């Protein structure tokens, strides 16, 4: 079967390391909060939605950050992804959600683990791609019209079209995972 260059860069893109940054510490200057892990600078952008508690001064405390490198370099930049970081010490999963996968004429069930109680779009888009990619053949064919589709407990939906990048500027969207229904996949 075919597929595209621009199908590759998304495959190339997704396949990439993502990582966490739990309960840490940064300082924010203009849109972009800087946080200092190991030896290595992180400068995140800010979308504008993020669901943060309100702040006096330039310190950004008590946060994770899902950390994705755009480009190559000296200084990581990423987009998006601050969440307040968890209250509880467990470890263990927060939610557990019916995950489908519609295929052309099958469905296949799984649940899907969330290990955040307030959780990015960045994230989740991220993590279920790669699943996607790894065990669902994501990215072997053109993706076409193949949305990821996440229902809230209140009916109300996000959607991720598997075809482009998640828009830069919803990096910044954060739900609560308790809040999570389902997740529904067509490819
Ligand atoms: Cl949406
Ligand atoms: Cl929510």
Known sequence: EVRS???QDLSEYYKGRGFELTNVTGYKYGNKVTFIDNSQQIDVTLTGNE???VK????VSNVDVFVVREGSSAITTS???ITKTNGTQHKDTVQNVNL???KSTSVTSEYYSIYKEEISLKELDFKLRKH???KHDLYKT???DSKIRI?????????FELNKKLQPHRMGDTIDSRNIEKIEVNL
């Open 51 to 53: 669901k943060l508690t």
């Open 56 to 59: 006096d001064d330039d310190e």
């Open 151 to 159: 229902t809230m407990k209140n009916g109300g939906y996000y959607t």
């Open 79 to 81: 987009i998006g992804g």
């Open 142 to 144: 053109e993706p076409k």
């Open 100 to 102: 489908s996968v519609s």
């Open 132 to 134: 996607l990619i790894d």
């Open 5 to 7: 260059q621009a199908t």
